[PDB]
Design a protein around this ligand. Structure first.
Ligand SMILES: CCCCCCCCCCCCCCCCCC(=O)OC[C@H](CO[C@@H]1O[C@H](CO[C@H]2O[C@H](CO)[C@H](O)[C@H](O)[C@H]2O)[C@H](O)[C@H](O)[C@H]1O)OC(=O)CCCCCCCCCCCCCCCCC
Ligand SMILES: CCCCCCCCCCCCCCCCCC(=O)OC[C@H](CO[C@@H]1O[C@H](CO[C@H]2O[C@H](CO)[C@H](O)[C@H](O)[C@H]2O)[C@H](O)[C@H](O)[C@H]1O)OC(=O)CCCCCCCCCCCCCCCCC
Ligand code: CLA
Ligand code: CLA
Ligand code: CLA
Ligand code: CLA
Ligand code: CLA
Ligand SMILES: CCCCCCCCCCCCCCCC(=O)OC[C@H](COP(=O)(O)OC[C@@H](O)CO)OC(=O)CCCCCCCCCCCCCCC
Ligand SMILES: CC1=C(/C=C/C(C)=C/C=C/C(C)=C/C=C/C=C(C)/C=C/C=C(C)/C=C/C2=C(C)CCCC2(C)C)C(C)(C)CCC1
Ligand SMILES: CC1=C(/C=C/C(C)=C/C=C/C(C)=C/C=C/C=C(C)/C=C/C=C(C)/C=C/C2=C(C)CCCC2(C)C)C(C)(C)CCC1
Ligand SMILES: CC1=C(/C=C/C(C)=C/C=C/C(C)=C/C=C/C=C(C)/C=C/C=C(C)/C=C/C2=C(C)CCCC2(C)C)C(C)(C)CCC1
Ligand code: OEX
Ligand SMILES: [Cl-]
Ligand SMILES: [Cl-]
Ligand SMILES: [Fe+2]
Lengths: 80, 35, 451, 30, 137, 333, 341
């Protein structure tokens, strides 16, 4: 009742599924490869399971300065 | 008939749905990560 | 499609089973198919439990709720609850699975293929909910069937191998019950006991002789009531007291089932006789008493005098007095001093726990049992992490007593809600205002003002 | 002194309950 | 941090000889510890006797010392008190009391070595959490 | 016949407050519970709740205000034992061991169950549909969970909720310590029920108030535009539907008033049913989710989550609650 | 006719999703707040700000994921991506908690956009704007809790993190440190929320059980037509029912629905006032008379004193891990414990 095609008319049509049987698996595989190639760790800075601590440390790397925080995180990452 | 395709509704639906399917693929891949 | 839409039936799809109220054949199909579902779950769940069963590990550590029921009947277990043969479990599972196939065939046949109404096909199988004689006759048939089932439990206990007895001399063992308590004083004194602490009503039945005698009484009473309702019509007071309709009978059964669900919750939580701790794990009271016993044993081995040891508040650290004078375990487990278990009763004298038998007569099997029951208390998380809520993730344990009690409290409460729903609706439909207030004849408009 | 105040306020609330139930404006159906 | 072979290197005997566990051996030891011991030894503490625990220092001061693989395997075969003056197999699980502790029936020598290795490796991983109780949760 | 006249009076709809047979049970039990509650809240002596001879004062005369005052639950030494007045040797002993709590909660639970039955009964006498009592079953289930089912599962009426404000807060905090109720899905469904109930209450009220038909002038209150017993609807349902359908989209808005009011009934009632069931299922110690030490790094170090912070708070509550009552390492009940 | 008027015509066009002028503020800000939360809970850690894992990528589930607040050393920094902390680096911005301030600021402006949408749609449709007035209470809650409370405190660190278990931590923090249950403004908030839920349930059940029979269907939902003029339920019958059950009853439908507006909105506003007080640590922590009595009399115990002991336990056992910037080292002997346990 607003000049748009009904959703039931769209999702029951064959052209919709011709498009979306391509697009929906492509996006799902794109997200899968975004995680499984390890790119998400690089983009968001999230540690891998071997990257939380150094080999013989138990201290959590915590940011303690405001305007040198970027350098402090870089120093944390240099210590592996 | 003669319905359009690329409306405001289309844009809203896809701005919600495209990242949703991408994120679902990402989390499904996360389920197979070992320590 | 007969009565299969809202226009002809008056009921929407979400109340679609209410379309079956006056279709006796399809209603019979729904019931038989649902019975097939119940038997299917029994068989399939038994086979699932058996496929993952490790016989040396205790049953209550393995998330089992159906194998303990078979083991309590004496099938497949030896002394101390040790599993000696898993084949009876397999037989029970597969016979239920095959019987569920038969019941599913019958339910499907009567639901979609058989006659929609049974009244034209047979006066015997046809019924009308308003015919009170036919309703009492069907109730009588089912009462006779239930009485036969109770006598089947009696027959298992007395002739076909016996039942597991956790109170048997020398640990729990499979025992044939040869002298069931037929005295009506004992049986109906269980019926008249208080439900509160120290009394426990029928949950407190603590020997298999009382259980078997009670089932003898239950079977005979059910068979006699079945014959009574086959041969007799409802009296005038019964005819004036009840609503006589299908929804009304459903609501009566819903209230009865809600009460039975609450009782089963209390039975599995407190009773360690018909739910032996060898199979279901210790009860909560049992585990608290086990912790007190364990640390009494440990500190007595270190040289402490457990009778004269004084806790932080001045009460006895290990031993104190109940409000009626009995010598009981100290600490918070003072609330659980009515607990009775076969590992604890050898230390009890006439005045409660006895200091001399505590000092000299605690056996290694009792210390083992106390430690095991202390460390398998019915406490755990929804994701099955054993222990208190502050415990870390290493122990995968929730007691089957917890699962059974919680699930059946949920079911009993929802069936009380269903009883209220259907009893109110049956009353309103009998009086004729279940669809709403008549605009022309609104009753409140004919009533005087309150003020 | 504070106990008397609490009991007084509670008793005033109960009296208000009485008047709101039994001496209400009658709902006059029009 | 990773599960390096230096982490998985533990004393074998009291003399000073050491062994290096594989990651499969360590994970099987953790699984068997959770199967047979964790109900009373979760986190390295003892539920039914909290004054003793599975810390490496506590095992080292035991008689005979239990801070090596061979001592822990011997304890799993013949448990004693802390001073080694009395045998406690009737109340503690063991191979010699597998009839009264059924979860010890199918434990092989490799299973005992893996459990002992898990006990010795866990403090090196968890710090004061192992045997620390609820303070270190 | 005197019995026929009494039956006519009991079931009479002309009484200012309906009695009914459920009310024949309800009035004495609720009167007894109310009178004993007022007397105990003002003047009861301290109660040894934990059974360790450590009396807790909850009445106003013994040093409490409205916030801190409570009727203290009965002694842990009593447990689930029935403790009426005649079971005590004297009134001093009955007051010391928390007998008033058992009297009040038993009379209240019976009276509130009969209140539910009375709601059905009056709906039947007025020709109403009968399910207001079903809606009332949700707070009644909550009261049963905190006053009866949780003591039964834990084995003592001392673990029931105290009849006071600060006692209620003590109950909440100790419950979170022992059961981690915040991580329980049934309590989360209950929070969704009450938050959604408040949301949909504000929403329905604002949407009806927004679409009121102009019947009054600017000086008078708009409430005088409605007359009691009038036949026409006092607001434009279509205008409210048009507003709310443009606020989100057309198919998220109710155009059916009956479906909307069923939803208003159903959402908080089902949510509160689930949270009452959560309290009962945690009474049998099926606790909320335990994710302590769930996240582990490659070596094996514990990586803390917010669940570990919640666990630290729960541990603080656990080691401080009932500080003298525990003699043994595990708080098994 | 003027570009402004043509743009106004396009923005106010009837659609599946109404846009309006308020949509320019609402849809980008609301979309970015929701997308930032989903992105943070899916991919972004809290390892450098709190020492926690808080994303699905690290192994947390739906209950334990959060977009955590920035580190306490950030203070009340806006933490703009181009600001002096991140310096345009997206990875460092995520690692420093910039997603938290991103979500908080975009959510605040999205809430503004949604209330402006309520005003604009009410103006176009032709109804009174009471829905926007009712929505002022969630806005007050969000502003007091997520903005005013951390601004009164030392940093954004003590604001709630956007996550389920993180919000549970926030609740337990307010109990342990603020004694927030004792606060009368929180008590008024609880009364408003529970009374709103009660009113919702009771009004829905009352309407559904006083319906007029307007059809022959046993399911009564089809017996209502939206264009009908008559009331669908009996107000007189409902009034008599509640007058005889409860003693009092509504007799004015307009007053009933205004009361349904009034109760939860007023409750939420009272709780927001209390949260402002807690932003300044102006707590209702203790009653001085009870504490003087308990200090001088070692036999005087109430439930309030027991709650104070519980708060001491919460603070001492929670603070070293909940506030890692303080570098709290509480030895085992200083931790307050009861006997045993
Ligand atoms: C609206 C929503 C409303 C829904 C609310 C429903 C509440 C109903 C709950 C109880 C129903 C069943 C009562 C029952 O089985 O009642 C009996 C049970 C059993 O009680 C316990 O029973 C025990 C029996 O076990 C004893 O005997 C056993 C035998 O093996 C063991 O040896 C065991 O160790 C030993 O102690 C003990 O006596 C306990 O002290 C005693 O508390 O009581 C209990 O849980 C009930 C306690 C009192 C309830 C009375 C109210 C109902 C009217
Ligand atoms: C409802 C309406 C609809 C909602 C609209 C939502 C829109 C979003 C608005 C967001 C506002 C962000 C403001 C950030 C802020 O405030 O940021 C705070 C800063 C002040 O900085 C703080 O200053 C503090 C005091 O410092 C001083 O003292 C220290 C100790 O001596 C040092 O010497 C230091 O150098 C010195 O500057 C600390 O250093 C803090 O870490 C630091 O964050 O003020 C400032 O930017 C400006 C302060 C001006 C007032 C504005 C605040 C409004 C509310 C206040 C309530 C208080 C209770
Ligand atoms: C235990 C669950 C259960 C059972 C036994 C029934 C049974 C029945 N429902 Mg029903 N229903 C249920 C749940 C159930 N319902 C639920 C949850 C809903 C809500 C969605 C409904 C909604 C509903 C509506 C709206 C209606 C019914 C109706 C009916 C009756 C006729 C169905 C029909 O015409 O089939 C037609 C369907 C089919 C032919 C599809 C195939 C169905 C078969 C049985 C599948 C069997 C699968 C199984 C694996 C086969 C095993 C065979 C093997 C043993 C040999 C029938 C007695 C109707 C009625 O009252 O009729 C008057 C009706 O109108 N139901
Ligand atoms: C032996 C038990 C029993 C029986 C025979 C009936 C029979 C009936 N009920 Mg009833 N009811 C019961 C118990 C029972 N009820 C209980 C315990 C409650 C309380 C919750 C109710 C509440 C109730 C209401 C509120 C209503 C009925 C109605 C009806 C009638 C139509 C039902 C229908 O079509 O459902 C169709 C089935 C569905 C729509 C499916 C519902 C799905 C459920 C609620 C969720 C189950 C979740 C599951 C257990 C766990 C998760 C599974 C996972 C896959 C997600 C029918 C006469 C209706 C009526 O009055 O008609 C006259 C009606 O409106 N019932
Ligand atoms: C509650 C169960 C129940 C009930 C009341 C009925 C009732 C009926 N069925 Mg039906 N049926 C059922 C279950 C049931 N069936 C099951 C499970 C199946 C699958 C095997 C069938 C398959 C079936 C078919 C294929 C036909 C019927 C027919 C009929 C009608 C006539 C039957 C007759 O004259 O008696 C006949 C009586 C007997 C043969 C005596 C049988 C005695 C049994 C074997 C003893 C079993 C012991 C004990 C009672 C049950 C143990 C299992 C228990 C633990 C669950 C009647 C309405 C007929 C019909 O409607 O015609 C139009 C028809 O053609 N039924
Ligand atoms: C499934 C079981 C079942 C069902 C549904 C029925 C159903 C019925 N029976 Mg019945 N009956 C049964 C089994 C059953 N019977 C058995 C096994 C026997 C043999 C002992 C009898 C013997 C029997 C007789 C002798 C009579 C009935 C009658 C009736 C009818 C009226 C019932 C009535 O008002 O009682 C409702 C209950 C009462 C009025 C009792 C008062 C309520 C008290 C206060 C409840 C107290 C219990 C409380 C909940 C606590 C529980 C514990 C307690 C034991 C301490 C009804 C059709 C009557 C009839 O019309 O028959 C023709 C009749 O006279 N029955
Ligand atoms: C209309 C919707 C809207 C609104 C209200 C906001 C609002 C905000 N965003 Mg945001 N954003 C939006 C859409 C929106 N965003 C979109 C669509 C994106 C995707 C590209 C982003 C991406 C984004 C990021 C990545 C970040 C923000 C941030 C911010 C916050 C700080 C912005 C700031 O300081 O610059 C304020 C800038 C202005 C008010 C512009 C002023 C323009 C006027 C007309 C003056 C004229 C200037 C003149 C012509 C040029 C001068 C030239 C020279 C002299 C300099 C603020 C709450 C930051 C944040 O959240 O920090 C935590 C942040 O890091 N936004
Ligand atoms: C409908 C009457 C009953 C009331 C239902 C109450 C519960 C509904 C809960 C809402 C969620 C589910 C909706 C029901 C859905 C339902 O019942 O389905 C039916 C409904 C209508 O489908 P049809 O194909 O019949 O109609 C499409 C029309 O174009 C026909 O002209 O479908 C939808 O709208 C699906 C949702 C997809 C569109 C989502 C758009 C998202 C984009 C962003 C929007 C932001 C809005 C907010 C801005 C501030
Ligand atoms: C009516 C209806 C309905 C329902 C239905 C039903 C409910 C049915 C049932 C059904 C059933 C209830 C079925 C059953 C089946 C079964 C079967 C078919 C089985 C078989 C078995 C077997 C084959 C076995 C096997 C084995 C063995 C021998 C041993 C080993 C293991 C195994 C498993 C391999 C519904 C809802 C859909 C709706 C519509 C209509
Ligand atoms: C097995 C056993 C036993 C036994 C048991 C018995 C013997 C039982 C019986 C039981 C019984 C014998 C029961 C009964 C019940 C009853 C009831 C449950 C009732 C109900 C009622 C009602 C429901 C009513 C109603 C009414 C009223 C209120 C009024 C008017 C109206 C009417 C009618 C509705 C013992 C324990 C020893 C042991 C274990 C085992
Ligand atoms: C931050 C940032 C940003 C943004 C971004 C975005 C905006 C994103 C988005 C995103 C998104 C937008 C995503 C999505 C997601 C989703 C998901 C992940 C979903 C999930 C779901 C599920 C899982 C479901 C569930 C359910 C429910 C809820 C209930 C019922 C059942 C079911 C299952 C159905 C930018 C670059 C601009 C700038 C810079 C920063
Ligand atoms: O009392 Mn009231 O809270 Ca139930 O847990 Mn054991 O007991 Mn006492 O501690 Mn924790
Ligand atoms: Cl406490
Ligand atoms: Cl204790
Ligand atoms: Fe309304």
């Amino acid at each position: 009742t607003t000049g748009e095609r009904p959703f039931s008319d769209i999702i029951t049509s064959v052209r919709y599924w011709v498009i979306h049987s391509i697009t929906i698996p492509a996006l799902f595989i794109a997200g899968w490869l975004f995680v499984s190639t390890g790119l998400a760790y690089d983009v968001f800075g999230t540690p891998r399971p071997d990257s939380y601590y150094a080999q013989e440390q138990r201290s959590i790397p915590l940011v303690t300065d405001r305007f040198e925080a970027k350098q402090q995180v870089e120093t944390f990452l240099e210590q592996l | 008939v003669s319905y359009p395709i690329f409306t405001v509704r289309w844009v809203a639906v896809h701005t919600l749905a495209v990242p949703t399917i991408f994120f679902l693929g990402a989390i499904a891949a996360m389920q197979f990560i070992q320590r | 499609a007969t009565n299969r839409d809202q226009e002809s039936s008056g009921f929407a799809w979400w109340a679609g089973n209410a379309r079956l109220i006056n279709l006796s054949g399809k209603l019979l199909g729904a019931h038989v198919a649902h019975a097939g579902l119940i038997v299917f779950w029994a068989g399939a769940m038994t086979l699932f439990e058996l496929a993952h069963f490790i016989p040396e590990k205790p049953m209550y550590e393995q998330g089992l709720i159906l194998i303990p029921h078979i083991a309590t009947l004496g099938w497949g277990v030896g002394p101390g609850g040790e599993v000696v043969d898993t084949f009876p479990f397999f037989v029970v599972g597969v016979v239920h699975l095959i019987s569920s196939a038969v019941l599913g065939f019958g339910g499907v046949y009567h639901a979609i293929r058989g006659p929609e109404t049974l009244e034209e096909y047979s006066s015997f199988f046809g019924y009308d909910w308003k015919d009170k004689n036919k309703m009492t006759t069907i109730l009588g048939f089912h009462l006779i069937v239930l009485g036969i089932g109770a006598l089947l439990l009696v027959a298992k206990a007395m002739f076909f191998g016996g039942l597991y007895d956790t109170w048997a001399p020398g640990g729990g063992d499979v025992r044939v019950i040869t002298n069931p308590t037929l005295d009506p004083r004992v049986i109906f004194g269980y019926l008249l006991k208080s439900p509160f602490g120290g009394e426990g009503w029928i949950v407190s039945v603590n020997n298999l002789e009382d259980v078997v005698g009670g089932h003898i009484w239950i079977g005979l009473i059910c068979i006699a009531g079945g014959i009574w309702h086959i041969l007799t019509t409802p009296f005038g007071w019964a005819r004036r007291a009840f609503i006589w309709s299908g929804e009304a009978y459903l609501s009566y059964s819903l209230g009865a089932l809600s009460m039975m669900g609450f009782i089963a919750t209390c039975f599995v939580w407190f009773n360690n006789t018909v739910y032996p701790s060898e199979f279901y794990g210790p009860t909560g009271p049992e585990a608290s008493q086990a912790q007190a016993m364990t640390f009494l044993i440990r500190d007595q081995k270190l040289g402490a005098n457990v009778g004269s040891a004084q806790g932080p508040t001045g009460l006895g650290k290990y031993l104190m007095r109940s409000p009626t004078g009995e010598i009981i375990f100290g600490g918070e487990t003072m609330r659980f001093w009515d607990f009775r278990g076969p590992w604890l009763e050898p230390l009890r004298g006439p005045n409660g726990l006895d200091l001399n038998k505590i000092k000299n007569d605690i056996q290694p099997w009792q210390e083992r049992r106390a430690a095991e029951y202390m460390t398998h208390a019915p406490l755990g998380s929804l994701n099955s992490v054993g222990g208190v809520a502050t415990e870390i993730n290493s122990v995968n344990f929730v007691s089957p007593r917890s699962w059974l009690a919680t699930s059946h409290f949920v079911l009993a409460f929802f069936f009380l809600v269903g009883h209220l729903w259907h009893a109110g609706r049956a009353r309103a439909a009998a009086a004729g205002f279940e669809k709403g207030i008549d605009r022309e004849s609104e009753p409140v408009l004919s009533m005087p003002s309150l003020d | 002194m504070e106990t008397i105040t609490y009991v007084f306020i509670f008793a005033c609330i109960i009296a208000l309950f009485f008047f709101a139930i039994f001496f209400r404006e009658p709902p006059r159906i029009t | 941090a990773e599960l390096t072979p230096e982490v998985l290197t533990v004393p074998l005997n009291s003399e000073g000889k050491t062994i290096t566990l594989t990651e499969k051996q360590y994970l099987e030891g953790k699984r068997l510890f959770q199967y047979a011991c964790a109900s009373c030894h979760v986190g390295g503490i003892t539920k039914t006797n909290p004054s003793l625990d599975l810390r490496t220092e506590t095992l080292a001061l035991a008689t005979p010392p239990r801070d090596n693989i061979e001592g822990l395997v011997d304890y799993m075969k013949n448990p004693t008190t802390y001073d080694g003056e009395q045998e406690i197999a009737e109340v503690h699980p063991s191979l010699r009391s597998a009839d009264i502790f059924p979860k010890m029936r199918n434990l092989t020598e490799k299973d005992l070595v893996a459990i002992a290795g898990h006990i010795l490796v866990e403090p090196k991983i968890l710090g004061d959490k192992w045997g620390g109780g609820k303070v270190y949760y | 016949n005197l019995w026929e006249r009494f039956c006519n009076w009991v079931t009479s709809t002309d009484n200012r407050l309906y009695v009914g047979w459920f009310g024949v049970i309800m009035i004495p039990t609720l009167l007894a519970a109310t009178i004993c509650f007022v007397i105990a809240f003002i003047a009861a002596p301290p109660v040894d709740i934990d059974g360790i001879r450590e009396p807790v004062s909850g009445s106003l005369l013994y040093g409490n205000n409205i916030i801190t005052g409570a009727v203290v639950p009965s002694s842990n030494a009593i447990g689930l034992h029935f403790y009426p007045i005649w079971e005590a040797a004297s009134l001093d002993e009955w007051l010391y061991n928390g007998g008033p709590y058992q009297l009040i909660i038993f009379h209240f639970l019976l009276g509130a169950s009969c209140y539910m039955g009375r709601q059905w009964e009056l709906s039947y006498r007025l020709g109403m549909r009968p399910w207001i009592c079903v809606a009332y079953s949700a707070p009644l289930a909550s009261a049963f969970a905190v006053f009866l089912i949780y003591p039964i599962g834990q084995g003592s009426f001392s673990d029931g909720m105290p009849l006071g404000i600060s006692g209620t807060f003590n109950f909440m905090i100790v419950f979170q310590a022992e059961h981690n109720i915040l991580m329980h899905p049934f309590h989360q469904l209950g929070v969704a029920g009450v938050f959604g109930g408040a949301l949909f209450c504000a929403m329905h009220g604002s949407l009806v108030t927004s679409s009121l038909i102009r019947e009054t002038t600017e000086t008078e209150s708009a409430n005088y535009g409605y007359k009691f017993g009038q036949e026409e609807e006092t607001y434009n349902i279509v205008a409210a539907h048009g507003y709310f359908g443009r606020l989100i989209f057309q198919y998220a808005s109710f155009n059916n008033s009956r479906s909307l009011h069923f939803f208003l009934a159903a959402w908080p009632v089902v949510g509160v049913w689930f949270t009452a069931l959560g309290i009962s299922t945690m009474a049998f110690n099926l606790n909320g989710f335990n994710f302590n030490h769930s996240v582990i790094d490659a070596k094996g170090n514990v990586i803390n989550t917010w669940a570990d912070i919640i666990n630290r708070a729960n541990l603080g509550m656990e080691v401080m609650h009932e500080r003298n009552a525990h003699n043994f390492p595990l708080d098994l009940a | 006719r003027g570009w402004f008027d043509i743009l106004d015509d396009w923005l106010k066009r009837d659609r599946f999703v109404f846009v309006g002028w308020s949509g320019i503020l609402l849809f980008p800000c609301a979309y970015l707040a929701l997308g930032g939360w989903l992105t943070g809970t899916t991919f972004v850690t809290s390892w450098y700000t709190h020492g926690l894992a808080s994303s699905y990528l690290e192994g947390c589930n739906f209950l334990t994921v959060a977009v955590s607040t920035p580190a306490n050393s950030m203070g009340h920094s806006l933490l703009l991506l181009w600001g002096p902390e991140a310096q345009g680096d997206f990875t460092r911005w995520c690692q420093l908690g910039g997603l938290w301030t991103f979500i908080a600021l975009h959510g605040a402006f999205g809430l503004i956009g949604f209330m402006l949408r309520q005003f604009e749609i009410a103006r176009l449709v032709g109804v009174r704007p009471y829905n926007a007035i009712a929505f002022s209470a969630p806005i007050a809650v969000f502003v007091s809790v997520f903005l005013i409370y951390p601004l009164g405190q030392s940093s954004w660190f003590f604001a709630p993190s956007f996550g389920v278990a993180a919000i549970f931590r926030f609740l337990l923090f307010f109990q342990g440190f603020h004694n927030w249950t004792l606060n009368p403004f929180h008590m008024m908030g609880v009364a408003g929320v529970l009374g709103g839920a009660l009113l919702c349930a009771i009004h829905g059940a009352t309407v559904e059980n006083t319906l007029f029979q307007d059809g022959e269907g046993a399911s009564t939902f089809r017996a209502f037509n939206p264009t009908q003029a008559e009331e669908t339920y009996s107000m007189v019958t409902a009034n008599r029912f509640w007058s005889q059950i409860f003693g009092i009853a509504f007799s004015n439908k307009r007053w009933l629905h205004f009361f349904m507006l009034f109760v939860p909105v007023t409750g939420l506003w009272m709780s927001a006032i209390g949260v402002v007080g807690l932003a300044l640590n102006l707590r209702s922590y203790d009653f001085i008379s009870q504490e003087i009595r308990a200090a001088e009399d070692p036999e005087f115990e109430t439930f309030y004193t027991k709650n104070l002991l519980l708060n001491e336990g919460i603070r001492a056992w929670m603070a070293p891990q909940d506030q890692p910037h303080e570098n709290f080292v509480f030895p085992e002997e200083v931790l307050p414990r009861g006997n045993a346990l």
